A paper describes a structure:
Aminoacyl-tRNA synthetases (AARSs) play a crucial role in the translation of genetic information by attaching specific amino acids to their corresponding transfer RNA (tRNA) molecules. Alanyl-tRNA synthetase (AlaRS) often misactivates Gly or Ser instead of its cognate amino acid, Ala. To get structural explanation why the L219M mutation prevents AlaRS from misactivating Ser to produce seryl-adenylate, we determined the crystal structures of both the wild-type and L219M mutant AlaRS proteins in complex with ATP and Ala.
DH-1, effectively eliminates Ser misactivation. Hereafter, the structure of AlaRS429L219M was employed to describe the binding modes of ATP and Ala since electron density for Ala was clearer in this structure. The presence of ATP and Ala in their intact forms indicates that this structure depicts the conformational state before activation. When the structure of AlaRS429L219M is superposed onto those of E. coli AlaRS, it was obvious that AlaRS429L219M resembles the open structure of the apo state rather than the closed structure depicting the conformational state after aminoacylation. That is, the more dynamic Val204 of AlaRS429L219M invades the space intended for the extra hydroxyl group of Ser, whereas the relatively static Val204 in AlaRS429 allows the binding of Ser without inducing clash with the hydroxyl group. Structural analyses of the pre-reaction state revealed that the L219M mutation increases the flexibility of Val204.
Residue numbers in the entry:
A (entry chain A): 1 to 70, 74 to 425
B (entry chain B): 1 to 71, 74 to 425
The structure:
């Protein structure tokens, strides 16, 4: 089942159950200036959940474009499950149904619409949420040995210091004994064997300025399921980067690098980064040294640095815009409309960074050759930031590849000294 | 080697190196209203480290009484071999004097030369962005590099606060051997009692200002801390802190009061831990109450009493453990001996007060657990036991933990908001 088929099947399943199918919001949130990028299907409905905005539907469903880079940027290429850019499939209840319907909707979709066998699924609840435990174990009657009760850090949510909060229940997919890791709640739960597929958030209480808890007047539901993780389940593959919607991207990156080794991790990094960078440019973000524009700059330049690692000879990053648009333009026409703008923007940024990347890498490679210890010193980090346009995390990501770190504190001291020279 | 011998040797080792040996401060901190109880040897020297207070010594050493029951290790007592509410922290301090090289050499010398601990039983970690500390350990001291880990800022970077001094830390661990569960620092099961953190060295190296800018600290400083009970267990060949010499008379007396012969029973160890924090807190001026420091004391007292109930003790018992505590540690802490009768009176009265509702409250709890479907004691039971029977939520939750149950905190909080409205 292709990713587009799964996205549509998800949305059709909830439309049939009376959910208003709504479009994704932009990656640049409007109703939330403090937030860098849209990181969940929840964001555009935040004011509805708060009761500050009225809409004429009390149940919705979306496929939401999200970026988590300000944070999953350092997991890209190192795990089978993390992206900067991903799509979150969500259903929402605005004071309509609550735990019982949300749980059955999700279990029905996974085990009946999608046909996933219950023996491959694992469920967690908040260890203080007896309603969700009772619904799962006594009503749905799931296998209790593939079940865990988890503390507040993973299974309790709050919109902020004030406002709605409540327990969460989560559904995981067991990729089997060939992948390293243990079930949720075990010491190696972080492994890629048991992948979190679907997160169900139950908005159940209100916390006020003084810290008091009260019942939420209209208990609400917000869920989110990563499209790529469920696509990997439905296509029988272990890694997100093996699904249909990444193949053209990885194949094109490979073609530009002149290699047939489709297992090279820099290809996956480049494939991930073009998705976040292209979609961000199409939502209006432009490279700069501040705010949202610097996050984009940081991600572009890191993709370029990985092309350097692969030995790519000519400006390349902008060339992945077209296969992305061909692959996702049906679902995201704003990509097709802005294709030319996105290509120009990415090309210019790569050309601008190329005037210092080669020299900066020579300094980096020389430093790695002569270094004693495992820490790149702060003055070198600052030299690369200040003269050669290397963001600190770009330098740190290169250092990671040679079992090295970078002196963040030493870099910060260099920055204060520079303010002192001004 | 007894705990008192280790305490004295530690202080004498640093006194020879020109450290002024200073007394422990109180568990109730001065010039620091935000902090609940003194929780580290640093607390009394904080203003010296900040340059706000002048003293006529630039290096010191103390054995500091500490309590960690807030802001917090109360829920680890009895469940790990290594955690207390009350413990003594052995520290040496440099006030802009020596720095990383001497601190590391002082620490290694004391463990491997004074105390004779084999290097094959020690494990060292550094901040993974601290090349100076790595170089000193690996190139100068020349420790075995396979018993060494480079750890990120969560475990090995320290800061006094959002502004003020900060810097990297290096830590020394002891390997209790293959019969204990756990892995080395940095491994997935680094938690667990096999590799126990013995000594923490804090290097005050930078200053962070209001806006988050770092500058070099004008006079780099050192603050260290090593738990007396953990090193005593190493030096006495035992796995659990509670098996060391300084806990034996306490656990033995508690066992006699409970009529049991199992000197390792975990509720005995909890009772032995709690009398140390409760007695020393009362001796430092704290009194049971429903607010602030007095409520933390009340909570620890009542949890000890509830554990006596679990062991079947029928007659008020908790205050009877002050006398063996004072006998065991009175040489080191004479204020305990002077305040002994007052401590016993306060602890006795508090138990008699809780006893007016403890039995009835437990019947409600035991009946609730017998008929309970699910794993969560509901919020209205939690609020009833709190509001009518004086059961702190963590007391009720600690009972529930023993039956693999949890407690509805959110539901309890909702009940509390409703009660405030009835006012
Ligand atoms: N960076 C990412 N890359 C790929 N998929 C992701 C990423 N972040 C989240 N997902 C997917 O989206 C789903 C919903 O994410 P969401 O943030 O709501 O859950 P979560 O991270 O468990 O939340 P919480 O941290 O509040 O417990 C996840 O279950 C996962 O399938
Ligand atoms: N056609 C392909 N052949 C090989 N690797 C690919 C291909 N397409 C993508 N990759 C990426 O290369 C990564 C590493 O593959 P590797 O050969 O090291 O392990 P593998 O046998 O594919 O195991 P797994 O499927 O669990 O990753 C994969 O996880 C995947 O993201
Ligand atoms: N609750 C406790 N019970 C017994 N010993 C303790 C307790 N807390 C700390 N110690 C001992 O005191 C030493 C110093 O404590 P300290 O808090 O400085 O180290 P830490 O816990 O690593 O702190 P940080 O994580 O802030 O660096 C520890 O190495 C440990 O041996």
């Amino acid at each position: 089942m292709t990713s587009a088929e799964i996205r549509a099947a998800f949305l059709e399943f909830f439309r049939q159950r009376g959910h208003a199918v709504r479009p994704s919001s932009s990656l640049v949130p409007g109703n939330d200036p403090t937030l860098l990028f849209t990181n969940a299907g929840m964001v555009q409905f935040k004011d509805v959940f708060l009761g500050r905005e009225k809409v004429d539907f009390n149940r919705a469903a979306t496929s939401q474009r999200c970026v988590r880079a300000g944070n999953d940027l350092e997991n890209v290429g190192y795990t089978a499950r993390h992206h900067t850019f991903f799509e979150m499939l969500g259903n929402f209840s605005f004071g309509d149904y609550f735990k019982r319907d949300a749980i059955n909707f999700a279990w029905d979709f996974l085990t009946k619409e999608m046909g996933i066998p219950p023996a491959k699924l694992w469920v967690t609840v908040f260890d203080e949420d007896s309603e969700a435990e009772a619904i799962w174990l006594e009503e749905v009657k799931i296998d209790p040995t593939r079940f865990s009760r988890i503390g507040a850090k993973d299974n309790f949510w709050a919109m902020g210091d004030v406002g709605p909060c409540g327990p969460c229940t989560e559904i995981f997919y067991d990729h089997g004994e060939h992948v390293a890791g243990g079930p949720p709640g075990s010491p190696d739960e972080d492994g890629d064997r048991y992948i979190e597929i679907w997160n169900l958030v139950f908005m159940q209480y209100e916390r006020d300025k003084d810290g008091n808890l009260t019942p939420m007047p209209a208990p609400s539901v917000d869920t989110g399921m990563g499209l790529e993780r469920i696509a990997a389940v439905m296509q029988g593959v272990h890694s997100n980067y093996e699904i249909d919607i990444f193949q053209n991207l990885v194949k094109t990156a490979a073609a530009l690098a002149g290699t047939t080794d489709l297992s090279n991790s820099s290809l996956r990094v480049i494939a991930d980064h073009i998705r976040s960078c292209a979609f961000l440019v199409a939502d209006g973000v432009l490279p700069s040294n501040e705010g949202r524009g610097y996050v984009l700059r940081r991600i572009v330049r890191r993709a370029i640095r990985h092309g350097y690692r692969l030995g790519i000879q000519d400006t390349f990053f902008y060339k992945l815009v077209a296969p992305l648009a061909a692959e996702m333009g049906a679902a995201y026409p704003e990509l097709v409309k802005a294709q030319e703008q996105v290509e120009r923007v990415l090309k210019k940024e790569e050309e601008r960074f190329a005037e210092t990347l080669g020299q900066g890498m020579k300094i980096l490679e020389n430093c790695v050759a002569k270094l004693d210890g495992h820490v790149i010193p702060g003055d070198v980090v600052f030299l690369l930031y200040d003269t050669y346009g290397f963001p600190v995390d770009l330098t740190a990501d290169f250092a990671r590849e040679h079992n090295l770190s970078v002196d963040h504190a030493g870099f910060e001291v260099e920055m204060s000294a520079q303010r002192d020279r001004a």
